[PDB]
RNA sequence: AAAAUUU
RNA sequence: AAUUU
């Protein structure tokens, strides 16, 4: 019945003007030779993407679906939750926030300048007063930065983001934060995968699969989820906040919001222009986030019930998600999860590559991540988790005249550090640079280069400064990332460790820690590295 | 654009 | 700031 979206024919236009790659790329012409594989989505790119998203979609619910949402609400009346000061929901604004289209941005906002704490309060009246006028919103074309890849046609179209006003973004918070806080987990128990570090999950995840007799384990990811969201749906994700105990106030925003916002509205380019009219989840609305976890969280858990899969733990993140079930042997597995597919296909949450079960942890890909494996100091396993490499190093070869790619180094080193491709190739790129312009001292990010050891020490152990045989599927995936981004191979980056290792070590210092610890892997004759006194 | 994690 | 959905 219901379009996802419908079109003008206006253009998505650019919301401020998108930079290209220069002749050279300094920091990083060095890490990687193929910078023409590297690029930026665009908004040239949002029409094709545009054209990807509109369809017809055609919801048939059943018992599971209708059950699973019944114990949802159960659930969701444990939970007793507040509005927000206008003040408080001003505050949680993020600095860069947008600026409102009424003269006014984020610095007011979060500064509570009085022009923007006024408009707020007559925002929120309107949405107490008037529960249908549509909001109007803008739509927008994500930059992310990706390697090409001629096997999956050559360029990724941009994502699009469609957002309200600040002043409604303010008044959201008011009426909804405190639910985003509570809801989701008192739903979800255990599987609600964003209250875990990658610790957790990779913990979670053994566990999960120790306590199986006989465990069979598969991921899902719908195509395109947030067009995939029914009004009904986003209705649904309404009754089941209203669950909550609340004021009678909150109430009446939370149903303003849905029937207003969240359902659908007209959509305008950043030139002004009515671009379409839109019926399905406009991720950009506080709700994202909570909604797509809940909302996929129910159809999953719904569709296993149809499916017959034994002994299901879920964990769930938006879109993405991960069952580990008991084997019911592989044929039956197999039509199980055939099953899963059509039923979740019912629900209007089609799947990308339709899924497989897998017996092997490894094989499970999600939120572009997976587990893997590698033998210790001691020689005892050890589980960590890892990615391919492929969009880390485009992305640390993504330098502009607006931009620098340092801050990315850093935050895979930190975020990745056991994994092989962060220590021999990020760890050895990054400290070869700041040793080179002198800035190890300096600050990026609000964190301190010379206390790496430390700061990976408190997160990942100690064990990530001695992991070593790391596995099949993991060396062949970065051998193969860096032929493709036409980066050294391995080898070359064991030399260049060598180098910044010996090279950090004559400077004594943390300097020389650093070069102790975080480059181990590099030397003949390791060392004994001992617990850091500051994790 | 929003949230979560990391810091 | 980083990453993810
Ligand atoms: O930058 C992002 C990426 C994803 N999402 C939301 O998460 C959903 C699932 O993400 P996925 O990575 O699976 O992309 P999609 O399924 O939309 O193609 C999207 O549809 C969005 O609604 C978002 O709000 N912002
Ligand atoms: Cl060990
Ligand atoms: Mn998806
Ligand atoms: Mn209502
Ligand atoms: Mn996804």
Redesign the pocket.
Known sequence: SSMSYSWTGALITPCGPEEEKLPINPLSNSLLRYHNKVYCTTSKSASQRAKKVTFDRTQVLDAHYDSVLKDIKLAASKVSARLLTLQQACQ???????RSKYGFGAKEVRSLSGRAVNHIKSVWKDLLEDPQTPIPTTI?A?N?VFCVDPAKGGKKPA?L?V?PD?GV?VC??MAL?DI??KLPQAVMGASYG?????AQRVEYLLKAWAEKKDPMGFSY?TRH?DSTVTERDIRTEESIYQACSLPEEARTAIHSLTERLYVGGPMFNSKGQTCGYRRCRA????????G??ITCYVKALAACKAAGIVAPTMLV????LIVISESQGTEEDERNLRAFTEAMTRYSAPPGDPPRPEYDLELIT????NVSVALGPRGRRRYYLT?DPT??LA?AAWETVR?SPI??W???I??YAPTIWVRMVLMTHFFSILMVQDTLDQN????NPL?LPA?IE??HGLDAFSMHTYSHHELTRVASALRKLGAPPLRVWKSRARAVRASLISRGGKAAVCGRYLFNWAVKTKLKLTPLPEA
Request: hydrophobic share 25%.
């Open positions: 949680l604004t993020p600095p860069h926030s947008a927008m994500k992310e994502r983001i957002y600040l973004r959201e918070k934060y985003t806080q964003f209250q875990y570090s990658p990811d989820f991720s950009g609305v506080l709700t994202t986030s909570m797509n976890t993140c938006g879109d993405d999600s939120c572009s991540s990615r969009t880390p992305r931009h801050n990315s850093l935050g895979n930190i975020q990026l990010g609000g964190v206390d700061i408190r997160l």
